[PDB]
Ligand binder design. Structure first.
Ligand SMILES: Oc1cc(O)c2c(c1)Oc1cc(O)cc(O)c1C2
Ligand SMILES: Oc1cc(O)c2c(c1)Oc1cc(O)cc(O)c1C2
Ligand SMILES: O=[N+]([O-])c1cc([N+](=O)[O-])c(O)c([N+](=O)[O-])c1
Ligand SMILES: O=[N+]([O-])c1cc([N+](=O)[O-])c(O)c([N+](=O)[O-])c1
Ligand SMILES: O=[N+]([O-])c1cc([N+](=O)[O-])c(O)c([N+](=O)[O-])c1
Length: 313
């Protein structure tokens, strides 16, 4: 991950009269702690985070998810506290839409030195019995709402040659993802995705393989909040409603040695969100058919998105 440019540092503020977040770190398995220690040691060596002293009172929770492990930060409270900074109706009509995570970009952009204290986090000790290892970010963090806002002018400059050369392709950005849609034959669409990823890479932006959607095959919206309600429909399936119904659907509810309701609900939350972004450009608030304590206990075991939505129970 390349070096940062000090002149790209952008001042950023909390909302007036709000202090930084102090959300405690929940306990992690020793396997997850080891993984985070390894990740954070590398980030620190590369200047992306720094160990902090005893004066800093803020905290944002972190966890680890998977072959390899990735660090996930729950910035929901910092996001609420951070200052504030069009959706194509045709995206859902495209033969293919590939979702590309472009959050790697953020490691190459500095965070306002005065704001870094609000990104503090702790790698926990085993059982949270002794003080953890405290760090803060020096670069735009993934999951923070300021990061895509601050990176937007560079993202635009980077994408411009691709968009100019491909008027048949729609590119929509939402949070840290690009949604790249076309009506090309799947092989030709995939070639365009590869050209895009190679262009990003040329400018220092690595991407994982993208996720492919085919929304033209999917089954009154007020742009002025989306609610997604999932309910148990007996022993064997899930139903859901999206309303402000705008959409309803179903998923299988399976029992087995490698699944459970929390795992299935995290999957359905991700899929409903992705579909809602494609169709309307908005992330729903969720109502989940599970007890808070059970959810709060296990959702991070299976969560795969970089983003984390709001949910009630
Ligand atoms: O979620 C993850 C997982 C990783 O394995 C890594 C992450 C983040 O961030 C960095 C940043 C660096 O600048 C250099 C690195 O090696 C890594 C590894
Ligand atoms: O990985 C994440 C997680 C979030 O929660 C958010 C992200 C990215 O990006 C944005 C961008 C905006 O322009 C406005 C937002 O509220 C958010 C929230
Ligand atoms: O989890 N936490 O919220 C948390 C917070 C602080 N602190 O200074 O604000 C800690 O020192 C530790 N700690 O060291 O374990 C944890
Ligand atoms: O490691 N840690 O993240 C950690 C966290 C907490 N906490 O309540 O959130 C602690 O009280 C302690 N502790 O007491 O050592 C450590
Ligand atoms: O020692 N500690 O484990 C510890 C833990 C927390 N905490 O919120 O979990 C703190 O806020 C502080 N603290 O602020 O000093 C210390």
């Amino acid at each position: 991950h390349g070096p940062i440019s000090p002149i790209e540092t952008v001042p950023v503020k909390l909302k007036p009269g709000m202090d930084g977040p102090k959300v405690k770190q929940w306990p992690l398995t020793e396997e997850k702690i080891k993984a985070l220690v390894e990740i954070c040691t590398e980030m620190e060596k590369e200047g992306k985070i720094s160990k902090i002293g005893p004066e800093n009172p803020y905290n944002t929770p972190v966890f680890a998810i998977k072959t390899k492990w990735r660090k996930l930060v729950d910035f929901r409270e910092l996001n609420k506290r951070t200052q504030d900074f069009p959706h194509p109706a045709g995206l859902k009509k495209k033969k293919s839409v590939t979702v590309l995570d472009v959050g790697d970009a953020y490691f190459s952009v500095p965070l306002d030195e005065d704001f870094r204290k609000y990104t503090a986090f702790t790698i926990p000790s085993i059982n949270n019995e002794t003080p953890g290892i405290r760090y803060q970010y020096n670069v735009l963090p993934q999951g923070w709402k300021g990061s895509p806002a601050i990176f937007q002018s560079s993202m635009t400059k980077i994408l411009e040659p691709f968009k100019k050369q491909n008027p048949d392709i729609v590119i929509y950005q939402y949070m840290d993802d690009l949604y790249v849609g076309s009506d090309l034959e799947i092989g030709q669409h995939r070639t365009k995705i590869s050209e895009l990823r190679q262009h990003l890479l040329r400018w220092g932006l690595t991407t994982p393989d993208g996720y492919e959607l085919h929304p033209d095959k999917w089954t009154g919206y007020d742009p002025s909040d989306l609610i997604a309600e999932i309910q148990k429909q007996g022993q064997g399936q899930w139903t859901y409603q999206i309303y402000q119904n705008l959409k309803t659907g179903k998923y299988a509810r399976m029992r087995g040695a490698h699944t459970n309701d929390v795992k299935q609900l995290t999957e359905a939350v991700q899929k409903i969100t992705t579909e809602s972004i494609v169709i309307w450009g908005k992330t729903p608030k969720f109502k989940l058919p599970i007890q808070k304590e059970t959810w709060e206990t296990w959702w991070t075991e299976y969560w795969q998105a970089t983003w984390i939505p709001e949910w009630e129970f």
